[PDB]
């Protein structure tokens, strides 16, 4: 009955038990193009594939917790609880914002969160465990944009960069990013080899490709500095001393570093601006799942879920009532 914590993230799904440190299953996610469930059936199917194939356990036994996007619309949440309880018949449920879990994973309730997924990079300031919807800033300069730069810069190289080939085509441009992309001005560079052995001296492309999220549209620095502008006046010092980063798409060499400079030179120098360096892929890839895994485990989670009971007595309305 060990509680199950799943992350349904836009580009990969991170799934696992509350008591374990790592999501035992991390596979590619699609029904989440914008950020919320676009296809309920495909959403329901991949969830079905999760319980049976990924974890090999019925949903009817364990308590279940799901995480959702900060900017998601309510109707998604009401339908999700409707779909989840009706189809899987779970004993207990809960919904939490991904950003909230990250702040929980980083053990810092009051903070500001930077993350990116499929098509979206956003800034969300969270105070006292509450997401300030008004403060959220959502930008399109996500990892997909940078990879699309890679893909085009690969097509111009004229290399040979059914749906699986597209998965391979997408997978490589991401894999290249981790190895090469860092934020003649770059000096000699790597000798990265493709599986077939093709390669090239990847020169300034490693430096110009990442620059798009800063300068291709609002750069990530602009995304955040404004977000705090939109939030309250006096908590802003708290957010600056508590900025966090999460998400595999944020994994670029000197990325977090360049972010510190951009903010340090954009924020007032007197400010105590600090970044929390969970820069490791494992940290970033698990950060959301970690917070959820912690959340479910705790001894006050025993009153926080939406038990199956609440769902008989009340329909979809409970989602807005039990989950902040």
């Amino acid at each position: 009955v060990g509680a199950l914590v799943f992350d349904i993230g836009s580009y990969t799904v991170r799934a696992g038990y509350a008591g374990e440190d790592c999501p035992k299953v991390d596979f590619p996610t699609s029904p989440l193009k914008n950020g919320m469930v676009e296809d309920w059936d495909s959403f329901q199917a991949i969830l079905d594939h999760t319980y049976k194939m990924h974890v090999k356990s019925e949903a009817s036994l364990h308590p279940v917790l799901m995480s959702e996007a900060p900017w998601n619309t309510r109707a998604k949440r009401e339908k999700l609880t409707e779909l989840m309880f009706e189809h899987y018949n779970i004993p207990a449920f809960f919904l939490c914002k991904t950003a909230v879990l990250t702040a929980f994973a980083n053990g810092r309730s009051t903070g500001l969160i930077l993350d990116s997924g499929a098509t979206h990079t956003t800034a969300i300031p969270v105070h006292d465990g509450y997401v300030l919807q008004q403060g959220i800033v959502k930008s399109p300069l996500a990892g997909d944009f940078i990879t699309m730069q890679c893909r085009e810069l690969f097509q111009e190289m004229n290399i040979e960069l059914r749906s699986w080939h597209n998965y391979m085509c997408n997978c490589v441009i991401q894999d290249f990013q981790a190895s090469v992309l860092q934020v003649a001005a770059q000096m000699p560079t790597v000798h990265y080899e493709f599986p077939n052995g093709y390669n090239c001296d990847f020169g300034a492309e490693r430096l110009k490709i990442p620059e798009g999220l800063f300068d291709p549209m609002l750069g990530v620095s602009h995304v955040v500095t404004t977000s705090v502008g939109m939030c309250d006046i006096d908590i802003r010092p708290g957010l600056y001393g508590s900025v966090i980063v999460a998400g595999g798409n944020t994994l670029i060499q000197s990325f977090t570093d360049r972010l510190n400079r951009e903010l340090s030179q954009k924020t007032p120098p007197s400010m105590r601006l600090k970044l929390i360096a969970n820069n490791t892929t494992v940290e970033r890839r698990f950060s959301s799942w970690i917070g959820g895994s912690i959340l479910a485990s705790l001894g006050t989670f025993q009153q926080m879920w939406i038990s199956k009971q609440e769902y008989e007595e009340g329909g979809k309305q409970c989602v807005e009532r039990k989950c902040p």
Partner: peptide
């Protein structure tokens, strides 16, 4: 409750 597991972490 956050303060509570911060107490447990304490």
């Amino acid at each position: 409750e956050i303060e509570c597991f911060w107490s447990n972490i304490e």
